[PDB]
A paper describes a structure:
The tumor suppressor protein p53 triggers transcription-independent apoptosis through direct interactions with BCL-2 family proteins, but the molecular mechanism is not well understood. However, anti-apoptotic BCL-2 proteins antagonize the activity of pro-apoptotic proteins by canonically binding to and sequestering the BH3 domain of pro-apoptotic proteins through a large hydrophobic pocket (called the BH3-binding pocket). In this study, we present three crystal structures of p53-DBD in complex with the anti-apoptotic protein BCL-2 at resolutions of 2.3–2.7 Å. The structures show that two loops of p53-DBD penetrate directly into the BH3-binding pocket of BCL-2.
To stabilize the p53-DBD/BCL-2 complex, we used a fusion strategy. However, we noted that a BCL-2 construct (BCL-2#3), featuring a shortened α1-α2 loop and certain surface residues replaced with a BCL-xL sequence, could be expressed in high yield and was suitable for crystallization. To improve the success of crystallization and to ensure that the linker does not affect protein interactions, we linked this BCL-2#3 construct to p53-DBD via three different glycine-rich linkers. In particular, crystals of the three BCL-2#3-linker-p53-DBD fusion proteins were successfully optimized for X-ray diffraction, and determined at resolutions of 2.3–2.7 Å in the P 21 21 21 space group. The RMSDs for superposition of these three structures are 0.2–0.5 Å. p53-DBD and BCL-2#3 had similar interaction modes in these three structures, indicating that the linkers did not affect the complex structure. Two loops of p53, the loop linking strands S5 and S6 (S5-S6 loop) and the large loop L2, insert into the BH3-binding pocket of BCL-2#3 which is composed of BH1-3 domains. Two hydrophobic residues of p53, Leu188 and Leu201, penetrate deeply into the hydrophobic pocket of BCL-2 and interact with BCL-2 residues Phe104, Tyr108, Phe112, Met115 and Leu137. Around the hydrophobic core, Arg107 and Tyr108 of BCL-2 form water-mediated hydrogen bond or direct hydrogen bond contacts with p53 residue Asp186. Asp111, Asn143 and Arg146 of BCL-2 form direct hydrogen bonds with the backbone atoms of residues Leu201, Gly187 and Val203 of p53, respectively. In the crystallization and structure determination, we used glycine-rich linkers to help stabilize the interaction of p53-DBD with BCL-2 or BCL-xL, whereas the two complexes showed different patterns even when the same 16-residue linker was used.
Author numbering:
A (entry chain B): 7 to 32, 90 to 202
B (entry chain A): 95 to 288
């Protein structure tokens, strides 16, 4: 079950990075709606994602707790599908930003961080709100 | 049993509302009439509301938006969306489907269903104007036309914008009328006539 959610991270990041030139990796319709919802969010909230980035100084030495602090602010008032989509999109923005700075190794780290935060804090909410197929029913 | 207050309160920070100088030309998505204090818009289109301030409020300030019915006959009824648009799947993931007012382009938005008043509201953090500008601009969305029968059903409403501190104490209040319709231009020049 936790391994099933690690896949959603990697598939989301791999397709986001494949939309640019970079190639990377370390039913399908659930990932289809997530990816398009996420493409919507980078237009609507480009300035928020830019702020979240600047407060997370993304360096080779950046620890996980720094990333979990920024993401925990995103869910401060509660967890919903919109904020969950922003979470996937923000992670993808960080992976795209890292390979654009000649720091491709940092992608593998961001993916791990997203998988951990997903299982540790978001997954219990996801199961109690109709699972992932409740998300395809609304979006 | 009580009604929110419409009374203007510029407060200690000189709080005042502003709007764009859009005309009443046809196919205009949202326009404001100073003489009527009434904004005209069509469903789901961005209506810019700018916040003008004489003294920048401290960090942690909030901007809340809430709708009330204008006629004293209906002021005690909660302004909610029609049944057709509640079940309508137009949700952005952030706004609950029953709310009439939304805010677009702000990840930090939050929606309140008051556990005592049952009145809807939407609130964002207050932030000072962008460097070089002079006012904070907020983009609201109205998710149901006033003509919608079964919801508003031809009843004019007001939007109340309030500044509050971290704990929700009033720092400023302003209000303006709103009509959500198909032709905001022709309908504006009409209401301006009578
Ligand atoms: Zn309606």
């Amino acid at each position: 079950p936790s391994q099933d959610n690690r896949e959603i991270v990697m598939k989301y990041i791999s397709y986001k990075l494949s939309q640019r030139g970079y190639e990377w990796d370390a039913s399908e319709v659930v990932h289809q709606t997530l990816r398009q919802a996420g493409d919507d969010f980078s237009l609507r909230y480009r300035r928020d994602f830019a702020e979240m980035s600047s407060q997370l100084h993304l360096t080779p030495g950046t620890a996980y707790a720094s990333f979990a602090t920024v993401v925990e602010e995103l869910f401060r008032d509660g967890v919903n599908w919109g904020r969950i989509v922003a979470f996937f999109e923000f992670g993808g923005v960080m992976c795209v930003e890292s390979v654009n700075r000649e720091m491709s190794v940092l992608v593998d780290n961001i993916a791990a961080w997203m998988a951990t935060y997903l299982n540790d804090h978001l997954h219990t909410w996801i199961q109690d709100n109709g699972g992932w197929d409740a998300f395809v029913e609304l979006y | 049993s009580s009604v929110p207050s419409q009374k203007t309160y510029q407060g200690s920070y000189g709080f005042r509302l502003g709007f764009l100088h859009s005309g009443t030309a046809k196919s205009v998505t949202c326009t404001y009439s100073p003489a009527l204090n009434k904004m005209f818009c069509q469903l789901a289109k961005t209506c810019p509301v700018q916040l003008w301030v004489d003294s920048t409020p401290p960090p942690g300030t909030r901007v809340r938006a809430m709708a009330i019915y204008k006629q004293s006959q209906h002021m005690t009824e909660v302004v909610r969306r029609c049944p057709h648009h509640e079940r309508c799947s137009d949700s952005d993931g952030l706004a609950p489907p029953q709310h009439l007012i939304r805010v677009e382009g702000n990840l930090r938005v939050e929606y309140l269903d008051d556990r005592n008043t049952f009145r809807h509201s939407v609130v964002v953090p207050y932030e000072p104007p962008e460097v070089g500008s002079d006012c904070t601009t907020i983009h609201y969305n109205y998710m149901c036309n006033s003509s919608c029968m079964g919801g508003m059903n031809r009843r004019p409403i007001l939007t109340i914008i309030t500044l509050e501190d971290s704990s929700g104490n009033l720092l400023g209040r302003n209000s303006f009328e709103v009509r959500v319709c198909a032709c905001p231009g022709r309908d504006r020049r009409t209401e301006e006539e009578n």
